């Protein structure tokens, strides 16, 4: 079961190993677009959190699922932020959701009082007000039920066939990270020019025992110009200084 484009589902993924290979190697994923990240590199990265949003929409309507797009969905049902980093995965669902003159459970909002904000979600289905006349019950021009169903008929073409979509939103700052990929750790090397990959931060330099008092809530240290001056090991939590060879 997948939710409608309005009142879409949201699942938080944290504290686990993300094996994106089993996700990419799926056949029915006919559309797989990522922003700010390449699918081949997902297995080597680590994020601070992951949010999976799922819903069903028309076929060509999937073009509205992208940063800064315009349209019914992108404006009143589900809007992605301009700085979105993640992936949008879609696959056909005619064998699952389509019914001849049926499948009313999938709906979308046609109009709204104002444009929906990024990652917003309006659970209520109150009737839009027309203004020129009082509207307490059902009414005409502007006071129609805001939701209307797709009614996925198998006779419809690809332009109106049901497509199942799930958007993977990744937060990619450097705060406590917990969704790293299947990469394997390696014994630490100190006092030698070594290439390091600390919880996703990749660089080169010599690692030395730190002498600065990191507070228990801090995980990284920076000099002028965002230069990472220190880092704490995600395994033994010891603070290490980074100096260019």
């Amino acid at each position, epitope marked *: 079961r997948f939710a*409608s484009v309005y009142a879409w589902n949201r699942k938080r993924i944290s504290n686990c190993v993300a094996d994106y290979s089993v996700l990419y190697n799926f056949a029915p994923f006919f559309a797989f677009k990522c922003y700010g990240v390449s699918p081949t590199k997902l297995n080597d990265l680590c994020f601070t959190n992951v949010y999976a949003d799922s819903f069903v929409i028309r076929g060509n309507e999937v073009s509205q699922i992208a940063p800064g797009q315009t349209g019914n969905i992108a404006d009143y049902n589900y809007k992605l932020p301009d700085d979105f980093t993640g992936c949008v995965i879609a696959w056909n669902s005619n*064998k699952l959701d389509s019914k*001849v*003159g049926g499948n009313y459970n999938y709906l979308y909002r046609l109009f709204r009082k104002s444009n929906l904000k990024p990652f917003e979600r309006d659970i209520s289905t109150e009737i839009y007000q027309a203004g020129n006349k009082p509207c307490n019950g059902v009414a005409g021009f502007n006071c129609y*039920f805001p939701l209307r169903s797709y009614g996925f008929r198998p006779t419809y073409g690809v332009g109106h066939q049901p497509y199942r979509v799930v958007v993977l939103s990744f937060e990619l700052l450097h705060a406590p990270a917990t969704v790293c990929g299947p990469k394997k750790s390696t014994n630490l090397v100190k006092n030698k020019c070594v290439n390091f990959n600390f919880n996703g931060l990749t660089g080169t330099g010599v690692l030395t025992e730190s002498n600065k008092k990191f507070l228990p809530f801090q995980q990284f240290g920076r000099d002028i110009a965002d230069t990472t001056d220190a880092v704490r090991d995600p395994q033994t939590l010891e603070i290490l200084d980074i100096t260019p060879c």
Partner: antibody
Amino acid sequence: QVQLVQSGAEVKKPGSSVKVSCKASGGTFSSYAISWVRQAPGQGLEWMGRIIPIFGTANYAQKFQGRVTITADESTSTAYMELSSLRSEDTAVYYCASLASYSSGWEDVFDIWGQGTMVTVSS
Amino acid sequence: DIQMTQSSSLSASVGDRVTITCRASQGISSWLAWYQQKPGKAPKLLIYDASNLETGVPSRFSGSGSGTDFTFTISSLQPEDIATYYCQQYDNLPLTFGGGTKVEIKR
């Protein structure tokens, strides 16, 4: 919270038309969808049709079209059912249930059911 | 058209495990439900998704299967299980129900 109530029992002659309805109590008529299902003596449940009062979309079973007609409104907030040219075999109990497949990713199951309307045909 | 066949009458004593299946001619996409019903009364919905129970029914009732098969199961019978159960298909618009399996308390 949602609950349904049906009409009383009825008895009429063969070949005539029988009218029956169910009140769309609880919730709202806009957030509700009704569907009629037949249960004959010695048989399981059998579909008659579905109606969404707010969308106005309706359909029937492939063996009861014309013979069965479905209608609904909001002023009374009820689904109207009319069965024309009823046979003597049409002696059965009709049910009016909630159609969950109407909204929010639910599916075509009936979470709320009414009592039941017994329609009998005899001379 | 799509149809099904429950397989018709059962008898069991409190505590034992019973299983029932409703076969079909074409693979239902896990769109199958099961109801509890006294013969000639308003049914009560128990299973609507193949692996999700509704609110109000205890975990004693269960179900399994996918595709062109399904199996409804009661982990243990109790005196309240004197009723018939109906397998329902909702893969397409022409809704159809099963004949109804009836399990009787066994003395």
